[PDB]
């Protein structure tokens, strides 16, 4: 097993960016060794661990940048599309329940004048 | 009869479930009766078979006692230590005879820490059932 | 069933039989043919329920 996300989440972006370059340079060496292995290698277990390791560091960097940007554009009118609530295409274009339940003033007053009574029949 | 119509009594659908089950379901399906000493000790009738378990097979060929050394979930069969196929020559690797988990009774269990928690979780749910569900 | 194939008869004059055949001459669309429709296919419009007074 390789890097754990918990150790990476603590690291600052600058340390995380060095961590990625080192794993990327290591990956070139691991791939070079496989190219020059000739007859057969030793399963190169390090190769998979450092390909998943590059993924974890990049994943943490994205969360570090995504959260930062979500905070900067918080409550601003017209925030970026990536941070907008997911919904669907139809749900964005559907009317809000308030807008759907909006009534003309004459239809609102009359509905108020006769409220829905609860009654029983013998 | 079964009053939950949501469940299936179709031979085809039920057999597909067995043949193509998720691993978590295959493991429970592969379970064995605990010995009467273990039944008094843990108060649970059956536990899913693990690797480190001493088991007594009451089956026809290969009846015996052994500790499981391999669990083959895909074949739905376990291989105890000791029970093996007849070897064509003495100088050959011994092949374990696969035994069904249902064909054996557990004599010892690998307690671990999760197995202790699992026996406790079942004991609690069984106690609630015993209190007039 | 049996009618998703595109089969038209090769016709008289090829020393074959006159039944519908596909592109290679494989017999099709006929009760006798392998993969042909039933001559009178079962239907769900059969009356299943009888009436009793």
């Amino acid at each position: 097993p390789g890097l754990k996300a918990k150790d990476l989440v603590g690291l600052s972006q600058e340390d995380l960016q060095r961590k990625l370059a080192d794993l990327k340079r290591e990956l070139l060496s691991l791939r070079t060794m496989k190219a020059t292995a000739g007859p057969v290698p030793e399963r190169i277990a390090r190769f998979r661990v450092c390909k998943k390791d590059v993924a974890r560091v990049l994943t943490v960097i994205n969360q570090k940048a995504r959260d930062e940007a979500r905070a900067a554009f918080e409550g601003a009118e017209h925030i970026p599309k990536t941070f907008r609530p997911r919904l669907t295409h139809a749900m964005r274009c559907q009317l809000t329940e308030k807008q759907k339940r909006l009534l003309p003033s004459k239809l609102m007053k009359r509905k108020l004048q006769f409220p829905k009574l609860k009654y029983a029949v013998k | 009869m079964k009053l939950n119509s949501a469940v299936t009594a179709s031979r085809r659908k039920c057999r597909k479930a067995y043949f193509t089950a998720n691993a978590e379901t295959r493991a429970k399906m592969m379970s064995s009766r605990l010995s009467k000493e273990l039944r008094a000790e843990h108060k649970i009738k059956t536990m899913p078979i693990r690797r480190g378990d001493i088991v007594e097979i009451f089956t026809g060929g290969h009846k015996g006692t052994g500790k499981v050394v391999e669990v083959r979930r895909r074949d739905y069969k376990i291989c105890v230590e000791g029970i093996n196929q007849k070897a064509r020559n003495p100088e050959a690797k011994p092949v374990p005879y696969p035994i069904h988990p249902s064909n054996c009774i557990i004599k010892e269990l690998y307690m671990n820490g999760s197995r202790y928690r699992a026996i406790k979780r079942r004991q609690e749910r069984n106690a609630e059932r015993l209190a007039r569900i | 069933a049996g009618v998703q194939c595109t089969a038209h008869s090769w016709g008289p004059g090829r020393a074959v039989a006159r039944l519908p055949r596909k592109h290679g001459g494989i017999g099709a669309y006929a009760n006798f043919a392998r993969g042909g429709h039933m001559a009178h296919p079962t239907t769900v419009i059969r009356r299943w329920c009888r009436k009793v007074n």
């Binding site: 409220p115 009574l117 009654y119 029983a120 029949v121 | - | -």
Partner: protein, 117 residues
Amino acid sequence: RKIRRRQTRLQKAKAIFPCPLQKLRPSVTRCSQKFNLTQRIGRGFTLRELQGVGLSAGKARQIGIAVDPRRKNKSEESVARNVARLKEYLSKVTIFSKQAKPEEIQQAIQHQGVVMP
């Protein structure tokens, strides 16, 4: 379809426990000379029938009496037959108001089927 329709009625009934599913609808002569002397249920009470019990269209609908402003009585007898029918319903109807006393709203029995068939 019978099962689905029963469930829809059962769920709608649960949503308004004291209230009956069916509104009071009028007694109307079956149209044509072939059924002149029989009566059937009609869409709603005329505004003349409503004035016999002294109820506005809003109040009548709020207490579960259907109102048809299109219907015209066509006879003095129809108004009286329908006015009588409203009086029976008004005596039968019980209005649960001024804070829902749960035991008394739970005590209430939903009427099922046509009201006064």
